[PDB]
C-alpha cells in the first residue's frame, strides 16, 4: 500500500515563488523517487520534474530555469518550488511516486495564480 | 598544512582500463585535400548505473590437519534469521566428492549465533561475520555497476552476475535478461531492512531482490529503470583538428587526442535521428565558442559543419577552416577565373592546394612523432608505478595494478592525519637481523573508531600488511613522507619530525645554486670486525639488477 | 678526445634535496582578474658558510673471537702528541658495561706511535691513521657547512655538531649558541698547524677551536663572522607569469617555475625595510630588461611594479602587462564612457574581462597539466637512476642516492684518463663459474700517486669496490664506456679498444636508415652437452621481473 497527499497555498499572486509539499508513505525515499505532474484547466497532463533516491534531479526544458525540487528522507516529504509564476500557471499539481513507474498518484492540489 | 593520508585497497578487476599504443607515422606526407578546422568528438553514452548490493555466503572447513570451500546461504535464512534477528544458522550444506554433505560449528548442535561487524573493513564497505568442523557465516555490503545493455552487473569483488539488475515481477520486468533458473531467484514485497550495526530496523518498505549464485547469495533493492538519457556525450572539444583524405577515407588528427580517426568520406545523416537536438545543439554551440575564442580574428568558416562516424564508435563533428592568407589566394584566383563562396571552391585550384598539403603535412607528421615519443615513455612509467600514473590520469588519488597487459583500477579511502600514529621503532624483536624497511603505523578510519595496524607506504599511503622487511644495516638514515612534513629515522629508531619547508627544493628544471660538499663516508667499526652489511639507501636500478645476479650465484652454490 | 673519469663517493646525507610533486589542476578555469606580466621571484638568502674541520677519534677492540666501539681523544693528546709530534697515545679510555675501562695496542705497554696517511682516501679529504686488544688512532680532515642561523654545522660525514662555528673566547663570542658543557670545549691562541703528510709545521699562528663530542673530537680554525650580505637573492627571472585572484588570495603561475605561489592580495611594504636598495634596485632593473627583450614591441606596462610575499618564504616582484589588442579595447571603451591611464581601469569593464579570463585560463591550465606530466615522469627516472638525474639537474657530475623519500647528494672527484688502466681479463680465478660483470680497473688519483684498485662503472664512473659479479655464460660480447671511446670484451677477455665515432649514432629522434640484418643466433655446443647458460646481454625490465620469479620457485623448492 502506498499513498501521497499534497499541501499548498491554493491561491498565490503572480511573479512570486510557489511552494508545495507532498507527504508520501509506503516506501523509502532513500531508494525511490517522486515525480511531479500538472494539468491546466481543459488541457492534458504535463510533466514537471523528478527527484530520484539520490540527490540528483531532472526538470522539464520549459521549466528548468524556474523549477526546483528538494526533499527530506526522515520526514518522507518532497518539497516543490517554482519561482516567477505567471498567469497561466493556474493548474492542478500532482505528485506521482516511483515505487513503480507511475503506479501510485496523489489526489492533487488546485493552484490558481492571480492578484 | 598537512595532507590527508590514503589507505588504497587492492583492486579486484571490476574496472579495467586499456591504454593507447604507438602508431605508424608516415615518413613523408601522402594525404590529399588537407585542411584545418574545429572539431567536437562524441563518445557512445555507456550510461553507467551504480548501486549497492549485499552479498551473503558461508565457509566450512574440517579441523583435521583439509577440504575448505565456500557455499551460499538459502533465501529463508536471509529473510528470517538474518533480516528478522541478525543471526545465521549453525548448520551448513555443501557438496563433497559429488555428494550431499552437511556440517556444524565445532560439531556442537543445530543453533543460531549473531553476526558481528568486521574488525577493519572500510566505512563505505561495511561487512559482518559470525567469527573472526568449523563453520562461519559472512555478510557484506559491496558496490555494483551496470552498463547501458543492463544485461549484467559486476560487483566490487570483480565477480560478474549474469542477470539484469532491473529484473523482477513487481512491474512486469520478466522481459529483462536473465541466465539463472527461476528457483534461484526470489523477490520480496514490503521488505524491511535492518542495519546489523544498530539493529534499528528500516522505517519504510523497499522491495528487495534475491539471487543465489554458485558461490554466494546477492540481494539488492529493485529500483525502476530511469528514463534513457541522450545516447551520445561530448568526449572532448578539440581546439584544432586537421582533416586529410587518403585511400578513400578521411583521416582526422589532433595534438591533444593522440589518436587518428578514419571515416568513410560520407557525412552521417544526423538529421535522420531526432537526437540532433542533443548533439546538433551541443555540437554547433561548441563550434562558435571555439571559433570566437581564437579563430574569429584570423580564420573564416567554410560552409556548414559536418558529422562523420569514425572507427571505434566515435561521432566527430567538424567545421573546416582556412586562414585569411589562404582566403586571399582563393578569392584572387577566383577573380581571375571571373574574367565569395569558399564552399565548392576549396581543393579546386591544384596549384594552390599543393603547398598547403605539404605545409599541413609536416604538422600532422610532427604531432604523430611527438605523440609516439610521449606514449612510449608514459607506458613504461605506467608499468613502473601504476599508482602514480593512474592517479594523475584521473585527477584524484587512485589504486591500480597491472593484470597482465591491462590495468585494473579502484578508488582509495582517505583518512585524516590526526587519526594516524607512527611507532617509535621499526625493528622487530621476534628475530634479530631483520627489520621493517618503512615505519610502522597505527590508525583509525574515523575519529573515536577502532584502531588498526598497518605500515607506512609511499606518498602518505597506508598499507594494511606489515611485510616490508629487509636485512638490517649499520649507519641507517632515512626520510619518510608523513602528512605535510617528513619523519626522520636513524638506526631503525624514530629521531624526530620536520616540516616540508625544511629541505632544499629543486622545483625548477635546473638549479646550479646547490651548496653541496664532498661527503666522507663514515662506517662503524662493526662492519669490519663483525662483517655486518652497511646501509646503502634505496636500491638503484643497477643495484637491483646487480643484486639478483648475486642470488643466481648463491643458488648455484647451494 | 677523451672525457675525464669520475670516482663518485657514497653520499652520507649532509646535503638532502627534496623534490617537487604533482598538483591539482582545475578542470575548468575559476580564477578572477586574470592578467599577464613580468615577474622576479626572490628566495631567502640562506648564506651557506663552508669551512674545513679536522676530526679525531680512536678505535678499540678485543682480540677474542667482540666489544668493538669508538671513542674520542682528549685535548692534551691532540695539541701535544699529534700537533707537536704527530703521534697518538697507545692507551685508550672508554666505558664498558657502564664502567670505566682502558685498553692498549696488543697489550704491550704505554707507548706512542706515529700516524700514516690513508691508503686511498681522496686528495681533498686527506686522512691519517696509526694502523691500516687492538687500538687504532685516526685523524681526518673533512668539510663542514653552516647556514644563516649559524647555530649548528654539519660535517662531511653527515653528523651534526650542535654548536655555532663562530663560538669562542677571543672576541667575546660567548653569546654564540652552544649545547655542550664548558669542560667539553677548548680554544688555543697562537696555535700552529702541522701537515702530517710533511710535518713542516705552520708558518704563522691561527687560533684553533676544539670540541669533544660523544663519538669524536672536532677542531677548526676560528674565523670572525663576515659582515652580513643582503637578506634575499634572485632565484629566477620569470620571462612570463600569469596572476589570478581566487578565494581572497592571488595565484601566480609560470611555465618554467612549475610551482604555483599564493599571496594575501596585499602588497608587502618593501619600503618598510632599507633593503629596497638591494631588492628594489635588482628587481626593477630586471623588469625593464625583460620588457625590452620581447614585450616592448607588443605590450605596455600597467602602473608601477608590485611585491608580494608568497607561501614558502618567496618574495615575488610583479609588473602587470596587457597586449596592445587588449589596450585598444580599454581605450575604445574608455572613450565611450568619456561622453590613457590603464591603472584603476583594468578589471572594470566586465564584458571585456570575461573573454580574457577564459583565454588566459586555458594557458594556466595547460601549463599545469603539462607540468604534472613532466613531474611524474621525472620523479620515476630519479628513483631509477639518481646519479644521472642529479647530475643534469645541477649541471655537473654528481653522486646521489635515495634516503627513503629524500635524495642525498654529494660531489664527485674527477681523475684524468691517463691515470687509469683496465685489466686484460674480467674472470676471477679464485672460484670457477663466477666472473665480474664489468672490467676491472686500477688507477691513481693524481700523476705519480699511489695506485688503487677498483671497478669500471657506468658513464666513465670508477667504483672502489669490486663486487659486480655474475654467473658466467658462453658467447659473451659486451661494450663498456672507457674514456672517449669504448672497450670491447668477448668471452670475459679484453679484445680491443675503439673510438666513439666507430659506432652508428641515432642522435635524431627517428632514424629509418639503419642498415640492419636478421641476426642468426649462434650458441656454442657446450650449452647443450654441458648445460651451461648462454649470454643474454643486460637484463630487460621483464627479465629482471621474470628472473626474481624463478628465485621464488627455487626458495619454495628448498
Ligand atoms: C565503411 O564502409 C564499409 C563498407 O561498406 C563498412 O563495412 C561494412 O559494414 C557492414 C555493416 O555496417 C557489413 O555488413 C555486414 O557484414 C557481414 C557479412 O560480411 C554480416 O554480419 C551482415 O550480414 C552484414 O552484411 C559489411 O560486411 C562491411 N563491409 C566490409 C567490406 O567490411 C564500414 O562499417 C563503414 N565504416 C564506418 C565507420 O561507417
Ligand atoms: C596571510 O594572512 C594570514 C591571516 O592573517 C596569515 O596567517 C596568520 O599569521 C600570523 C603570523 O603572521 C599568525 O599569528 C600567530 O599565530 C599563532 C596563534 O594562532 C601564534 O603563534 C602567535 O601568537 C601569532 O598570533 C596567525 O595565527 C595566522 N592566522 C591564520 C588564520 O592562520 C598568513 O601568515 C598570511 N600569509 C602570508 C604569506 O603573508
Ligand atoms: C579533393 O576534393 C576535390 C573537390 O571535392 C575532389 O575533386 C572532385 O572529385 C569529384 C569526385 O569525387 C569530381 O566529380 C569533381 O569533378 C572533382 N573536382 C571538383 C572541383 O569538385 C577530389 O577528388 C578530392 N581528392 C581526393 C584525392 O579524393
Ligand atoms: C577584480 O578587480 C577589481 C578592480 O580592483 C575589483 O573590483 C573592485 O573591488 C573593490 C573591493 O575590493 C571595490 O571597492 C571596487 O568598487 C570594485 N570595482 C572597481 C572598479 O574597483 C574586484 O573585486 C576584483 N575581483 C575579485 C574577484 O576580487
Ligand atoms: C569577430 O570579430 C569581429 C571584429 O572585431 C566582431 O565584430 C565580431 O563580433 C566577432 N565575433 C565573435 C563571434 O566573436
Ligand atoms: C647562484 O644564483 C645566482 C642567481 O641568484 C647565479 O647568478 C649564480 O651563478 C649561482 N651560483 C652558482 C654557483 O650556481
Ligand atoms: C621600445 O621600442 C621603441 C620603438 O622602437 C623604441 O623607441 C624604444 O627605445 C624601445 N625601448 C626599449 C626599452 O627597448
Ligand atoms: C635513407 O635516407 C634517405 C635520405 O638520405 C631517405 O630518403 C630514405 O628513405 C632512407 N632510406 C630508408 C630505407 O630508410
Author numbering:
A (entry chain I): 1 to 9, 11 to 116
B (entry chain F), C (entry chain E): 109 to 173, 185 to 251, 267 to 473, 501 to 719
Sentences from the study reporting this entry:
Glycoprotein B (gB) refolds between prefusion and postfusion conformations to facilitate herpesvirus entry into host cells. Here we describe stabilization of the prefusion gB ectodomain from herpes simplex virus 1 (HSV-1), determine ectodomain structures at 2.9- to 4.1-Å resolution using cryogenic electron microscopy (cryo-EM) and isolate a prefusion-specific gB-neutralizing antibody termed WS.HSV-1.24. We used structure-based design to identify mutations encoding alterations capable of stabilizing the prefusion conformation of HSV-1 gB and determined both pre- and postfusion gB ectodomain structures. We propose that prefusion HSV-1 gB evades neutralization by most antibodies through an iso-surface display that is coupled to structural plasticity.
To determine whether gB-directed neutralizing antibodies had been induced (despite the absence of serum neutralization), we generated B cell hybridomas from the splenocytes of prefusion gB-Ecto.H516P.L531E.DS-immunized BALB/c mice (screened by ELISAs for the recognition of pre- but not postfusion gB) and identified and sequenced immunoglobulin transcripts, which were then expressed as monoclonal antibodies and tested for neutralization. One antibody, WS.HSV-1.24, neutralized both HSV-1 and HSV-2. Although the gB binding of these antibodies differed in surface plasmon resonance and ELISA contexts and several retained binding in a cell-surface context, WS.HSV-1.24 was the only antibody that bound infectious HSV-1 virions. We determined the single-particle cryo-EM structure of the antigen-binding fragment (Fab) of WS.HSV-1.24 recognizing gB-Ecto.H516P.L531E. WS.HSV-1.24 bound at the DI–DII interface to three (306, 357 and 358) of the seven gB trimer residues that our analysis revealed to be refolding, exposed and not occluded by glycan. Thus, the prefusion-specific WS.HSV-1.24 antibody bound an epitope comprising primarily the interface between domains DI and DII, as well as surface loops from both domains. The prefusion-specific epitope encompassed refolding residues that were not exposed or were glycan shielded, suggesting the epitope to be immune recessive, consistent with the observation of no neutralization in the donor mouse serum. We also identify a prefusion-specific antibody (WS.HSV-1.24) and show that it neutralizes by recognizing three of seven less masked gB refolding residues, two of which are located in the flexible refolding region between domains DI and DII. Although the cryo-EM structures presented here provide strong evidence for the pre-triggering mechanism of D48, future investigation is needed to confirm that WS.HSV-1.24 recognition of prefusion gB can in fact induce conformational change.
